[model samples]
Target: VPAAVDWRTAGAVTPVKNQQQCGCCWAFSAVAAIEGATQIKTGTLTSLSEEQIVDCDTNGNDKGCNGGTPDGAFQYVVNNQGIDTESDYPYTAGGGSPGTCSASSYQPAASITGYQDVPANNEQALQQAAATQPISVAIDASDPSFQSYSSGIYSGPCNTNLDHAVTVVGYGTDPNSGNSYWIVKNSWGTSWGQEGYIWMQMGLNAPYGVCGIAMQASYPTA
Candidate 1:
């Protein structure tokens, strides 16, 4: 196993996406994990649709813009067998409310066989999963600091409330402070956090990890 890994350099990640005013950050996280897994497996990088999950996964445990979990979103995709592309379904839930389930009419963009969760509260498991491919993770982003985060290896003044979902693309130690961190990909626009990403402090030896990142995590299977 590698001491550090970054799937973005491997070209399995897509461009930074903005969720805008929508609460569908869960969908973004889920779609990102799916996109990485699909690209890593197929050698093709296609931008899948978060809108498909937000608009179509209403029948399941997902609540559209009101909020949901990557677990629920992945479960919906696994059952659906396929999802559409951003060019097809498109996202319109920036108003904080999801539109109708209209994904039935769009062309499928990619498919996942299943999804698996890492062992709870285990950063090692989370790291290994991310090394293989990007993983869906949750964080306690209730603090305004997380909202206004600009850049740096964020050492949180927050707790493990687990209020938001994001994707973990890689991990490594910073030479500046010798601090290890997880490269967290956020749904907020590029204007937020290290150009739409956050280097979250890791190696804390805490079960929940920084911001409760390891409390709950999952990834898609191609």
Candidate 2:
């Protein structure tokens, strides 16, 4: 079956502060998915506070980024009512930095629709799924080459290097270059990867790969 929602052509792109040395891939994916989906729904691209999700979302399952799931994180947002902006809950990666749930941070608009689960390894399925909603995907970024992948579309082998989470905004193919790239929003700050975003060669790899969206946010429109 085709995807249920259609993502907005234009959406806000926010920087995901690295949770260095922490297994917070779930946290990063959850917040990024919400941030993009919410922005698409409300037509506002305000940076929601990841800190709130980090500290306030410790109801069960996991805590402090050791491990978590986007599904659980979504429930936390809906159950807890709402979240705040980075200013309100700034990112404090490990180190016992003493986090605060202060309400004094910048307040940004929040939006919501629903959730989605894109299949694994099926790039077509993943794309079909992502085309309908804002997506959250994990990648193996353990490759040292990823740090210096600064150039034309990267189609190299990335299956074993998956280690980060990102958002898939759209898809396209450069007929001139004969390369297909996924329009992705990244969290390694705007400095890394094609101005905070990069294209992954979808069909090039056999599975939900370097430039693929493994999971997505299914919304009312999708």
Candidate 3:
């Protein structure tokens, strides 16, 4: 029911990133949310460090390259004072293993006061949250079709067992298909999907939400 929204067009979104072969989608999701929130707050776009989370935020629930969650990354950021820019701690470990945590390379770039999670299994809530700012969401990305997704309003079947993390930057109706979709940004580089993005079907009757995207959605407050 949103008119038409896209953070990328609004200048609040950053360039697409690639997580490579690492299972650090959680870091990318959290960092993307931070980047969008910081840009919307300061009117400046800066790429935050996913590597910092991938490396340093693995002490507890965050398992580094193995797997992690956005909330876990947010907690790490809150306790660690702040996060560094991508330039300071560039991503160099995404080959299915974590790199050493380098505290010396830390240089606070953006800080989040806290994070808020969308109500579980609420698509409307997720849409409202995303309309305001980019939201970090998880979905069932285990399907091979997701890996080969191209430019189109995807309405394929997806489960609600969250596994992969991504960012929902906007929502709108496809003029051609006349179907509402969530504009999602991915961390698989620009070669996948529509330039590292995907239009997920919205307004479905699924309780857990499309592809279980609404099961775990959150955003940072600057």
Candidate 4:
């Protein structure tokens, strides 16, 4: 398996509080995913604010922050132009949540080609796609293992019940632990995972490893 995506080089890590009763997992994951990869690729560890992406990227059809897709979120970026940072835009993850896209905070960094759904069995393709672009994905977090995943690397049975969205930063094995895990970035908070992130085990045919979102292309930003 390929090495886990390097968080050190990726970009600034931000832990977002998923608003209560909101289905905008797709929007959060897509924006957060791109922000990390964009920072790593551009050598800018700045926190790309999701508030702009959230309010502006809704594109009318999406269920606001309640629930959306990486593809729809990607398109929202392309249509709006770009996104801003927390300093410039700010976030509303914990608040009541914004329903419309905020015009004052549009600062898009990249434009995506489009969104596509990859099968769970195609682990190789998913890994390859993530290497080049940000992948937006949803996982069944209902598994007991996921809820209990507090610290340390984790590898367990695939549970397809809990449907939570997340961005795949990179894939690799923990040298110290000697266990292969997928470098998964979450929207929860920095205090949630190991340093605000968790490594999902990507074994032969792990279900979590296979489920994810892939970025096609992004618009250039300063």
Candidate 5:
């Protein structure tokens, strides 16, 4: 295990965003991963477009606004060569409905070569990957407690439902509990959670992993 890690302190993490009621958590998750990865690779932090992915990349299995996955988003980026910036393709899914894809709105900002999935059900591997860069991860985030989370390390009961997605920006042990946790960035606005972030318990309930976080984890390659 890493002694300690925090990407937010490292200046790799971008500003927290709000996806509202949209089931577009996957887009935010993937965009955050690419934002961190591109910053690490180029030394310049640029917020990429989740709107482009939500609107344009619908030919695949990912359904816009309804639900999607980071892997599918990464694949779209790889094939399209790049995605737009937030300025050009601003988020407009506030109503949690799919918008008409505007090809003219497409503007290439950052390009990702590909993405790789972390070893299934392996917290150690997830830690290794997150220590290097932000990673996209899925978790059981359907609990009402999760919806009302404010601060502190969250050790709440979560399963492998994989109903929601978020970005694992970093990982470390909480000073209060001395328990390991993953610093996750959520897209539910700054009013929610810890400024739209959560410190999820890590390295717990081995095999299944904490909140089944290890079940579906991946990161983009810049």
Candidate 6:
């Protein structure tokens, strides 16, 4: 893999977004991965609707505004064949349940053939995947420090009890610490972290990567 990869500069990533109080981070994560893949494959970085996944994906294990998994959301997309554009089904879940599922009301903005998972608890595997495209990952966001993480690499006080989902869009080596880090994109808007991102420690030596980020890693197939 390259020494560093930032998909943001390469036009594979959209701007930072917010999930608000709705625990729909998984939708954002899944949509983010698909967005990157769609951009990479088609050279058209169209923003997909997270709202569609949150509201219409109820047939799957995903619960809107409650909690869900990226794999399940990705499966919903695979089964649905495509996902709506953000402009078509804009995010309405700020801190409440998703609006009624109106998936049939709009046309799809992007589509993915399927999704694939990285090996469990393997940072190297995820790094390889992240080097290619943005990856959806779950993490233990229970630590208060993680909530207030403003800057720098987040070498956390996190556990394996994953409760939050995010996207790993790129990786880089810290100039000062010389430590490799994953550039994590959060759905907490641009106000949080480093403009809605946190650099997670890559070689945490805990087998599960920082905050168990490598445990449930996945990415879309464009």
- Best model number under lDDT: 6
User: Candidate 1, residue 39: CA error in Å?
Assistant: 0.2
What tens-digit string does per-residue lDDT give for candidate 4 at 80-110? 6665666776666556467455655445444
lDDT of 2 by residue, 1-222 (tens): 342222434554565455555566666667777777666566666666666666666777746556666666666666655667765566786553425445335453563444556666667776775665567776666555666666567775555445556667677777798777776666666577777666766666455565334433332121
**lDDT (CA) for every model shown?**
0.90, 0.60, 0.88, 0.59, 0.87, 0.91
For residues 1-222, what per-residue lDDT tens digits would candidate 5 score against the true structure? Answer: 567888888988889999987888899999999999998999988888888889888999789889999999999989889888888888998788767876455668799999999999898898889889999999889877787899988877766777888999988776777798889999998999888899988877687676788889999999
Give the higher-lDDT candidate: 5 or 6: 6
Q: Residue 192, candidate 5: how far off, in angstroms? A: 0.7
Stretches of candidate 4 off by over 4 Å are: 1-4, 10-21, 104-120, 175-178, 204-222
Per-structure clash totals for the candidates: 0, 19, 0, 26, 0, 0
Candidate 3, 84-153: lDDT as tens digits: 9899889987677767888556668888889998998898899889989999999988777787899888
Error of 3 at 29 (Å): 0.4
Number of colliding residue pairs in model 1:
0
C-alpha TM-scores of all predictions: 0.97, 0.77, 0.96, 0.76, 0.96, 0.97
Which is better, 2 or 3, measured by TM-score?
A: 3
What lDDT score goes with residue 39 in model 4? 64
- Pick the winner on lDDT between candidates 3 and 4: 3
RMSD of 6: 1.0
Q: Which residue pairs collide, candidate 3?
A: none
Error of 3 at 123 (Å): 0.7
| lDDT for predicted candidate 1 compared with the true structure | 0.90
Worst 10 residues of 4 by lDDT: 213-222
Candidate 3 Cα misplacement greater than 4 A, ranges: none
lDDT of 6 by residue, 4-118 (tens): 9999999999988888889898999999999999999999988889999998998878998888999999899999999999988999998686888888899888888888989
Global CA lDDT computed for model 3 = 0.88
